[PDB]
């Protein structure tokens, strides 16, 4: 898993009917690192630093098997800098 | 910036995770927190369209499991103006 | 038979001159007092209980001095009142059309 | 527009849909929210005849799915003037 | 005319046709409207015995079937004197 | 008056009744009308022990058979000295 | 005394009898009595522990079987100082 | 800390019994007590998250066979800014 | 008041509860307690003649079942002066 | 000591293991014994309402097999401020 701090929020309204209604976030390691998008599954603000499992976990910590997801958040760091 | 998202509950708990929820997951205003009588509770946000689409999705799902649950997630792409006078502008 | 707005409401008005372990299992034990005034744990020796024989404060001596002559709508009582076959959604394309999570309602009842 | 239109609703949200929706089918006047207790909340609107004829089967039949529901459906098309005092005039 | 007819009601639907029927069938002049709690409505009329039981009468027949219907319709021709002080003299 | 009576009603129109009945029934001031919620409503008088009694006994048989009914009808022949700071000294 | 006594109760009239009754029961003091909504009534009084649990044992037996009769029946001996920023200090 | 901590209970003896609870069993600040309708009532409590998470455990522990008892425990590890707004900052 | 009410109990616990369950139901004051031989204990108190009927109910009431029982509960409305010289006036 | 407890036996024996017993069981004092009359004897002790009453359970325990017996075990967490006219300070 990976430490990254959240960003902004992110809206796709086309998106696949696969997401359901999760949100994303826009999440980087650090400012000016490159962007990723995350799936919501805590409930985090911009500013947080949360911990983010990818590959297939992720699915499976957006919700289901089959949750098309291959980064989600799925805790809050209680104190990082 | 003109629609509207409202999701009530019953009861004071789910509301503030379902408006909690909303401002998390997209770019919306909390503009009113409505104690409708009798266990009702209502939260209003303003935004865009997809913006408010997002955030009142996201809202009534985290919301659906908390307390007593979720009544109603509603969202008005273009409010009349006339209902303009009934809702909030701001919180309290 | 006179008409008129006596025929009205007839059975309907009122006041017309006409009318006129140590610890007991939590599941099985509800408490008389909770908190401090439990009496599910069995305390021994020279506790604040009552015993059957003895008389006074409570009881038939706090209930018998006032005579009393007996005689819902809410958010909690309404989570099962009919509601009309939710919305569906007949839309194609992309557009986020998740038919699964929790209804959301656009403008005049479409699913959203 | 002196005939009255009434749409009753369990919580506030269908609330807000009907007087959408009621503002939008026909040249209605909201004149009021209520909140009369106990989850119900009554919209309240103002117009001719045939436009509040329209304007209340347009709110019910948008507002009967949207949450907890409707209640009540009510067209008043000549209002005594003693009603006059008991209804709002401007809506909060 | 001292005389009291009340008109009690689930909504305010309902309680403002009783009013609109009561004020349009007799010589009776509509002093109070009070949200009881629990989604109760009480309307309250005062005038002569002969126009309190008719207007009480049509309030009663008009508001039977309208939301979620009639509680109480009740006639006092007179109320005591201390009676008054806990009964509106007009309407807000 | 020293000794009080309690009426509790579910709605506004049997409170209304069994207070006239109880102040017309014997000697007994009417201190009280709150509204508690949920529906109840209660009213208290206040005045000498038997007009007290009397006065809760015609209450009660007055406003059984209104709206909704009867709740409670009780007689505190001298309330402590603490109680006497949470009850009404005069209607509002 | 620094022990805190709650009873619930539905309606009025309930909680003023036990009032009375904790009041005079033991060497307790009544420092509010609270409307919670939805028809719940709560009294709280203070003193000494068990002077508290004499004087809520008392009340609740003693309201049990007044109107729609009693919810909750609570002692906590020795409250957080930060409720005691929820708890009224003298009843009014 | 900007932890969030919510107890929904019906009636206020359970909503007192949780907030005592929450309040010894961690470092938290009781910010509000709501009475929301319809009996429900809202203890909400400040801190940092596993304060927090502490507290709301206890709490819920301890309410749910009080009165009525427990409808919701929840907790939000971080609140949104927008959500501050509808928060109560301190009790009374 | 001058009406006088008398319990008479067998043996002096009954006795004390009565006068108690007098003093505390209603409007009366105790003006002695009189050892009467054989075990007999009359309590006395003074008031209103409803108060004193109150009174004298509860009193027996109360200590119908604690020891030996009550012996007579008897109210004189009107005491003969003549009768005031065999009367204690203030309790020893 | 608010508190009052009262035992009553049938002669001096069983009331003298009864006082025995109150004193050693909890802290309260002994404040008189009466000899009523007819065979009755009445120990009183006062106190802290928990303290009299483990004393007034230990003490009918204790004298329940004594003598001619036990006839009542009363107490009373605070009697009215007139009935302590009628109650002895100290054993005489």
């Not at chain 2, 997809?50 to 792409?77: F, Q």
Request: proline share 5%; aromatic share 4%.
């Amino acid at each position: 898993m990976k430490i990254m701090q959240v960003e902004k929020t992110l809206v796709s309204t086309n998106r696949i009917a696969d997401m359901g209604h999760k949100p994303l976030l826009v999440v980087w390691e650090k400012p000016g690192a490159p962007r990723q998008v995350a799936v919501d599954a805590i409930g985090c603000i911009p500013g947080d630093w949360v911990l983010c499992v990818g590959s297939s976990a992720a699915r499976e910590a957006a919700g289901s098997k089959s949750y098309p997801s291959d980064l989600t958040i799925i805790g809050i760091i209680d104190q990082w800098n | 910036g003109i629609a509207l998202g409202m999701i009530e509950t019953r009861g004071l708990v789910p509301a503030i995770e379902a408006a909690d929820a909303m401002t998390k997951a997209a770019e919306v205003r909390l503009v009113g927190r409505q104690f409708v009588g009798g266990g009702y509770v209502t939260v209003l946000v303003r935004g865009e369209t997809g913006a408010v689409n997002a955030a009142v999705r996201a809202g009534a799902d985290a919301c659906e499991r908390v307390g007593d649950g979720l009544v109603a997630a509603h969202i008005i792409a273009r409010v009349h103006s006339e209902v303009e006078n009934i809702l909030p502008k701001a919180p309290q | 038979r006179i008409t008129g707005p006596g025929m009205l409401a007839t059975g309907l008005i009122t006041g017309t001159p006409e009318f006129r372990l140590v610890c007991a299992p939590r599941s099985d034990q509800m408490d008389r007092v909770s908190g401090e005034g439990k009496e599910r744990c069995h305390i021994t020796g020279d506790d604040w209980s009552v015993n059957k024989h003895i008389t006074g404060t409570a009881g038939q001596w706090a209930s018998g001095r006032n005579p009393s002559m007996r005689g819902e709508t809410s958010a909690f009582a309404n989570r099962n009142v009919p509601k009309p076959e939710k919305p569906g959604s007949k839309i194609t394309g992309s557009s986020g059309n998740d038919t699964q999570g929790s209804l959301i309602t656009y403008s005049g009842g479409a699913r959203g």
